[PDB]
């Protein structure tokens, strides 16, 4: 299932830590913690406040500058993000189950402490139709944190020093 | 909902007609019929024989050479493909509902005439866990057909001329 994960091709991407704003104004943050894991933190928008550690992902190199990260969430949401490092442009597609569209705050938590809850909501549904969000984003801040730094994304967006998400 | 669709960014991509084989051996064919539509045709693998016309998609430029196409299916499957035109490689992530993993032939049809059926199977489930296929592919044949050519994908894969899907460039 992770056959396509090729660490040797990902050395320019693993370790990246990006803050970005989608064209709809939602502000997101992702840390590429290793070849198969991300942490992420949502700052604003429909699910602002939600954050997630140790999400297993599929990370591939598309070109020298472009990388893709795709994953399935315990809520039922599926995601594929691409990043163009050179252009500092991200694109995401997010397929939300209908239950999230109807009541998105249900997912606004530190997910890792609410896994059973998320699975229950997922299982109760409804699932369909999906709310599909497909948007470009500007990468406003990007840094290289190296792999397996557990401090990059370790608290809620409300617990960060002033101006954190507004940098660059 | 199609705000990300930017025709000026897609002029090198619209009209492309690709035949490709995933690293697991499954052979797929896609036609980028316009800025928001594909037709596709599966030749082999878990759902070989399936074909689809007029699938609404989100097509975006990632670079000069790399484009992305993403979409939701009436089966519950969600898809995102990226094509690297220069390297003649494709990458797909496909998130199949569990019901498809268990009985994939249920989806082998001209889907456009079986929308209610696909949605029924989708609604009955199971949905979870998803069977996630994340795989590279080699693009074996690529040509420019221009937009809105209704003849490119207009029959089942069984009805094509003998070596059609094996042609290369």
Author numbering:
A (entry chain A): 24 to 191
B (entry chain D): 24 to 192
From the paper:
To date, several PADs have been biochemically analyzed and structurally characterized. PADs adopt the lipocalin fold, and the core of the protein is formed by two mutually perpendicular β-sheets. In solution, a homodimer is formed by two monomers that are related by an improper 2-fold axis. In this study, we used ancestral sequence reconstruction to generate thermostable decarboxylases.
The models for the remaining ancestors were predicted using AlphaFold 2.41 N31, N55, and N134 were crystallized with one, two, and three homodimers in the asymmetric unit at a resolution of 3.1, 1.6, and 2.5 Å, respectively. All ancestors showed a highly conserved active site architecture with identical catalytic machinery. Both were found to form a hydrogen bond to the NH1 atom of the catalytically active arginine in all crystal structures.
